[PDB]
Amino acid sequence: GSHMLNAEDEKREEEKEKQAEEMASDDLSLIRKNRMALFQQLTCVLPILDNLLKANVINKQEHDIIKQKTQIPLQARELIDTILVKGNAAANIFKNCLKEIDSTLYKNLFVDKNMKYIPTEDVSGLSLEEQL
């Protein structure tokens, strides 16, 4: 016997699975820091979703659910959540997707290490009944 079997379903299913902190490379820090930028500046949540859907924990169900009645902002939120679960393991897929989808973006993300910011949340245009 290579190893002895040990019960875990006794009391651990409810608890969240432990992530490999050791694996967590620096790239993870960059992704986490650029997390707001990605959510705040999204324009390719589809392309990346397609690439991730190729090989991930989500099947045709979870993928369809976020494609059933979910807008675009939420789609990005769920996609980000999938990265956290996978961890640095998905950093490669995430990075690979951006490189292919937007090679130029990579040259400004990891390379330049300087992400641009824009107040997209700030909007204006109130008019209950203009008649002037």
Swiss-Prot record:
Summary of the tissues where the protein is detected: Present in many fetal and adult tissues. Mainly expressed in adult skeletal muscle, thymus, testis, ovary, and pancreas, low or absent in brain and peripheral blood leukocytes.
Location relative to the cell: Cytoplasm; Nucleus
Domain of life: Eukaryota
Domain CARD: 23-113
Modifications the protein undergoes after translation, according to the UniProt entry: Auto-ubiquitinated and degraded by the proteasome in apoptotic cells. Upon stimulation of death receptors, including TNFRSF10B, recruited to receptors and cleaved by caspases. Proteolytic fragments remain associated with the receptors. This cleavage presumably inactivates the protein.
Coiled-coil boundaries: none
Family: Belongs to the IAP family.
Domain remarks in the Swiss-Prot or TrEMBL record: The BIR domains mediate nuclear localization. The CARD domain is necessary to stabilize the protein and inhibit the activation of E3 ubiquitin-protein ligase activity of BIRC2/c-IAP1 by preventing RING domain dimerization and E2 ubiquitin donor binding and activation.
Function: Multi-functional protein which regulates not only caspases and apoptosis, but also modulates inflammatory signaling and immunity, mitogenic kinase signaling, and cell proliferation, as well as cell invasion and metastasis. Acts as an E3 ubiquitin-protein ligase regulating NF-kappa-B signaling and regulates both canonical and non-canonical NF-kappa-B signaling by acting in opposite directions: acts as a positive regulator of the canonical pathway and suppresses constitutive activation of non-canonical NF-kappa-B signaling.
Complex and partners: Interacts with DIABLO/SMAC and with PRSS25; these interactions inhibit apoptotic suppressor activity. Interacts with CASP9. Interacts (via BIR domains) with TRAF2; the interaction is required for IKBKE ubiquitination. Interacts with E2F1, RIPK1, RIPK2, RIPK3, RIPK4, BIRC5/survivin and USP19. HSP90AB1. Interacts with UBXN1. Interacts with GSK3B. Interacts with several death receptors, inclusing FAS, TNFRSF10A and TNFRSF10B. Recruited to TNFRSF10B in the absence of receptor stimulation. When TNFRSF10B is stimulated, further recruited to the receptor and cleaved by caspases.
Name assigned to this protein: Baculoviral IAP repeat-containing protein 2
Organism: Homo sapiens
Lineage: Eukaryota, Metazoa, Chordata, Craniata, Vertebrata
Gene that this polypeptide is encoded by: BIRC2
Part of the intact protein present: 435 to 562 of 618
